[PDB]
Write a protein that binds this ligand. Structure first.
Ligand code: FDA
Ligand code: FDA
Ligand code: FDA
Ligand code: 2H5
Ligand code: 2H5
Lengths: 576, 576, 90, 90
């Protein structure tokens, strides 16, 4: 550990790794700190799903996700337990217990919101869905010139897609994916278009996908090394970053105060450039702990010195979910091109098709897989092969259906995994709504209660706004019920429902971007630079100031790439 | 990867690592294969609970455990789902769904049995309890000389304790630990002895324990390296070992057939010495897949050619569980030595004690922590510090209470973790019974059904034996109810219960040890060598042939140490 | 038609359930494997508790039930009495 | 006739129930028959069902009915957690 770096980065998730990839590549001396540890294997910050065992047992990965989602704000618990033995110590009040937050109104919370403290952040467990936002969801980078704004977004997203290895082809040979894609495409008849969910992933084999992560963006190995002898990078895991120190005039950051969790030692680290990519909640926390915005319960009679919009205009998506059981019509359709004679299990049984017949409903590869399944497993009553990949289908957000959709199988199951209905028949439906940014929707930090790292306790005051946000959310529910019925009826135990507020982990706007601090009610400009500060930048989904329904990480990455451009234009790397 | 090694070890759990430690240290050129992957941090095969984040969020570790416990044998599901939509594809029979095993009688199962496929095996998530077995639970290593038998077992257990870093004083300054320990010691004075559970762990700080694992035994780094420049070791993750090839004469193993799960390629690996440490299930599976014992549903009319006792005489322990809420009397005792004045929350509040006072019921370390908690958290109604470690209390197996006991807090929680009762009040109770070995209790492998790695599907035919097993199990239940009541009443939702058969993961005797193949109905001798084979050794809990209540891993490690002494005397390392 | 039931209407479901006796209940195949080893333990899913071994659980009307009281089901019914239109009517 | 535990969190004045009932085509294969060996609680031949909702119109309408309830009920409010849209037991 040095006292002095060119750039310090707080957080080793995919957005801090975007900064590292750009800046380490441009020759800067970079340090990165993460409060969590290396725990994805020898590929530092890699996807935890990239094991042969997890892909053979994919119902198990929900445990990995649950293991590393720590609830942001849990209200004091008021459950009545009145069947204790009379000898047991009993409470007279619902006192502050088990790490609960007495600041939190249980009825204005994002109960689902949770944070991940591990090298690579949330990208060690995410779904890897990376759609672009269309104009209606996206903030402006160029005003008054939409073609310039489109060009800039297309350049940035293209780069970001290269970093993550985004594609739309990894599931193209799944029978279930095509069964569901084709039926939806037919049913909508041009009113809505369907495609594969754009996924940050490369298929290795028919049974294994190498899911991308932070690791894919930047390998997180210390440099210089044999592969990069002229580069300078150090990662320090198990280091809590607590405060950025402001100069008197609030024009520059002078140091970063850190706490090494293994030694207990504390240090002041000096850099030319300070980059905060700790997540939408923890970036906000670190800034408040550093005298930006307002510590404590909001009090408009004491306006803050700096960043009055920090922690206001927060957005989280509404999320509706169900599962379906494939229709009889659709399952019979899988075998529409087959000629089936005799009785399964007898030596006179056969299944055949005519290769390349003009009038076949399915391609030869599909029919081949169906034939081999039905002849090799004559005990099985379904035509879908056993290790057929899941569907990964979307119709992207449009003005006539202003929600994002993911249709298939998600690793983040929400109840006990049922075993009565064959898994091959099950399709999940998740529809995600956009939320209007409103000043009253807040993330704030207590002036008294502290978290497990002795930092100001996060507190939400949030409700989905009346008007458009709420009308759309219910319309989205109805749309999921109507669409999903084209594929099958609901699975008992996975009926149509709204998920807990913030379960979807798409929080935005907590340190939002805009062109003018006052006019746009914002905290960073379009270089992701904190207003007034020469050398302080923020990255992440807390930057996004709009109402969006699509998954935000790709958009955050794109903003980070643009922020890097500004760094490269305004700071000189030290000589190697 | 070379084609030839001195010693090949299958499995990188703590027992394969014992073989690695002894034989790598003695100069052998060693290869180790594991079907699973390096997934745990830069300390290969280390304990997954050794992160700052898990020790601050210890309630989350149950997810890690669940995430890597893959059920062994799941019977065909017969749940009735009669609320599907009429359009949904609906079954006419309870057909083979979801990787279920149609061989399995659901009523003669070990439904809680599960396997872990990751580098370091189950020692990446275990509790680290390492007691010794007393004579009554322990197989003989010396016939007709009890004292020499005891001496041999003491020699081996002492080494094994050293390898795991076993100790009994890591919790000695826990208030909760001593509160429970002292009360049980008094209640059973002159009748039973209580102590700390012997734990494979080293305390690093008052809030952090470094739990041992396979990595403690052997670091799993490839050698030669700077620290061991004359040692030879390679670890090959993601390699499924499928068969040991017998010579025609059934006197020698000639090769190990492997499948590289990343490339998909197959190889035949030659060694002088073949060591199988794949766990009590998968050692059995690999041997039956290699022509030992009998494949398929047991058929006494076709005796097998080799190892007729393989997969018979299996034992698993009965487990009873509850949680209690601490009694009012015990809680009020924690602050018995304090003098309290003033108003909590005000500058007048004072809590003090007299160090050394002969009228003190507690030691000075205890009172100092109570006082500091009461002074720093004056709103809190309990006298126990928030980060006070859990109890780790036992009364070891004796003839008059023939069960192992663990009293405290286990990371393997069985239901949703309640949040309404303060966690400092909760004490877990787990009592483990011993099971008589009976030839009819079996683990066998299907000749048609295969598992996720295309290997013969394991099937159990198990019931707890009538007679002493069953009587003691129920008596154990009653003893838990009587003893736990001395501490507090039961916690609602964690009432006294038997756990699912095999949930405890203490399966033994599946390739059991004895002196004589026929007379002792066994598979390996006291060197752990497979009868009839010069160069094939088995390690693990499947060697243990007795009825035992205590946790078995220390005992298996003891036997592996003895095995390596034979290896070293009967095989020479190749030149470096 | 009691003052007490119309003041506590959430309780009437108990009346209904109390006099709905299931017509055909298939043999139960739920697995209970956490009995004490001393308890009497089934070797098969035998005919228990008035269950119907004729009944395929997958081709049943499991909700069908009957009421044996004077007045029949009209002692608990919802009292909805629409006419059928031609398309529904013999 | 409520079907699960009655919730007490949401004010009852806000709650509206929705029950839609479909029509089933008569099919000779759908049967109520009586065992020649098994008897009921009054020593009478035990009723047994062999029933499925017929394919074709009955099934199509059943699912379009579910969709119709989701569409209609949305005009009044969103679903109450614990009483989400579902088919009831046959
Ligand atoms: C958990 C989850 C998340 C997402 C998906 C699914 C699931 C269950 N699916 C997914 C998402 N996003 C998409 O666009 N597509 C999808 O398919 N998920 C969200 C995505 O995972 C995040 O948006 C993304 O990682 C955010 O990236 P980031 O801004 O780099 O933030 P992270 O939270 O990943 O990493 C922050 C990093 O900071 C460290 N930290 C926090 N506080 C400190 C302090 N004070 N000091 C030092 N370091 C700190 C963390 O430990 C963390 O690693
Ligand atoms: C999961 C668990 C287990 C234990 C405790 C708690 C819980 C929740 N606590 C514990 C236990 N034991 C104790 O004595 N004290 C306690 O406090 N647990 C049991 C303990 O964890 C095991 O007894 C021990 O690891 C057994 O060691 P081992 O014989 O080395 O076996 P493992 O299962 O750990 O590792 C085997 C290793 O082999 C690999 N493998 C499996 N099949 C194959 C094939 N075919 N090819 C190659 N490699 C294979 C597995 O991947 C595994 O890593
Ligand atoms: C239980 C129920 C039923 C209805 C509604 C709600 C609920 C929870 N709501 C309802 C109904 N029908 C409607 O048109 N509108 C609604 O809002 N329900 C059904 C209605 O309740 C029935 O269709 C009606 O009673 C049928 O009338 P029934 O043909 O007279 O038949 P019951 O079952 O009422 O009475 C028969 C009667 O005979 C006795 N019995 C049975 N077996 C024997 C033998 N062997 N010997 C002598 N007596 C026998 C019974 O004890 C019973 O009282
Ligand atoms: O709750 C599950 C969802 O979580 C969001 O964070 C992901 O972006 C979605 F792809 C989906 O997996
Ligand atoms: O089910 C939990 C139990 O698991 C066994 O494998 C352990 O040996 C016990 F210490 C205990 O943790």
């Amino acid at each position: 550990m040095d006292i002095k770096y060119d750039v310090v980065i707080v957080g080793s998730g995919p957005i801090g790794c975007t900064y590292a990839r750009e800046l380490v590549g441009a020759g800067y001396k970079v340090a990165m700190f993460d409060i969590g540890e290396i725990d994805s294997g020898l590929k530092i910050g890699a996807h935890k799903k990239n094991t042969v065992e997890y892909q053979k047992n994919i119902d198990k990965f929900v445990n990995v996700i649950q293991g590393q989602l720590m609830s942001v704000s849990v209200p004091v618990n008021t459950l009545v337990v009145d069947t204790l033995s009379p000898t047991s110590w009993q409470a007279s009040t619902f006192f502050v217990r088990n790490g609960s937050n007495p600041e939190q109104d249980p009825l204005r919370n994002l109960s689902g919101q949770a944070v991940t403290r591990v090298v690579g952040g949330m990208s060690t467990h995410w779904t890897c869905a990376t759609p672009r936002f269309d104009r209606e969801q996206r903030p402006l980078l160029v005003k008054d010139d939409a073609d310039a704004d489109d060009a800039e977004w297309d350049r940035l997203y293209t780069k970001a897609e290269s970093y993550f290895q985004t594609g739309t082809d990894q599931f193209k040979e799944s029978i279930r994916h095509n069964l569901v894609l084709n039926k939806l495409t037919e049913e909508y008849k041009g009113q809505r278009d369907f495609q594969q969910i754009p996924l940050a992933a490369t298929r290795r084999s028919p049974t294994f996908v190498e899911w991308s992560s932070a690791n894919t963006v930047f390998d997180l190995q210390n440099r210089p090394n044999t592969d990069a002898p002229e580069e300078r990078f150090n990662l320090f895991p198990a280091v809590a970053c607590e405060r950025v120190v402001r100069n008197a005039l609030n024009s520059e950051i002078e140091s970063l105060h850190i706490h090494d969790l293994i030694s207990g030692d504390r240090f002041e680290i000096k850099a030319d450039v300070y980059v905060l990519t700790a997540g939408a909640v923890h970036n906000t926390q670190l800034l408040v702990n550093s005298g930006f915005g307002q510590l404590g319960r909001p009090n408009p009679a004491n306006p803050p010195e700096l960043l009055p919009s920090l922690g206001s205009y927060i957005t989280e998506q509404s999320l509706v979910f169900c599962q379906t059981v494939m229709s009889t019509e659709l399952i019979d359709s899988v075998k529409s091109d087959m000629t089936i004679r005799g009785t399964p299990g007898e030596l006179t049984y056969s299944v055949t098709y005519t290769p390349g017949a003009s009038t076949n409903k399915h391609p030869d590869w599909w029919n081949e897989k169906v034939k081999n399944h039905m002849m090799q497993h004559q005990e099985d009553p379904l035509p879908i092969p056993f290790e057929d990949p899941e569907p990964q289908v979307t119709t992207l957000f449009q003005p006539s259906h202003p929600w994002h959709t993911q249709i298939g199988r998600d690793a983040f199951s929400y109840g006990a995994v049922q075993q009565s209905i064959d898994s091959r028949l099950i399709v999940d439906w998740r529809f995600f709504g956009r939320t209007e940014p409103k000043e009253e929707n807040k993330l704030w930090f207590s002036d008294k209660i502290t978290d497990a790292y002795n930092m100001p306790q996060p507190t939400f005051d949030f409700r989905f706004p009346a008007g458009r946000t709420s009308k759309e959310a219910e319309d989205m529910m109805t749309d999921m019920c109507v669409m999903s019925a084209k594929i099958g009826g609901f699975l008992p135990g996975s009926l149509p429902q709204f998920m807990e507020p913030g379960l979807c982990l798409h929080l935005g706007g907590t340190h939002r971007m805009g062109f003018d601090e006052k006019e746009d009610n914002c905290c960073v400009n379009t270089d992701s630079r904190v207003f007034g500060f020469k050398n302080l930048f923020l990255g992440g989904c807390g930057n996004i100031p709009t109402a969006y329904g699509a998954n935000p990480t790709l958009t955050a990455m794109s903003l980070a790439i643009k922020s890097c451009e500004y760094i490269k234009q305004n700071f000189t790397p030290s000589p190697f």
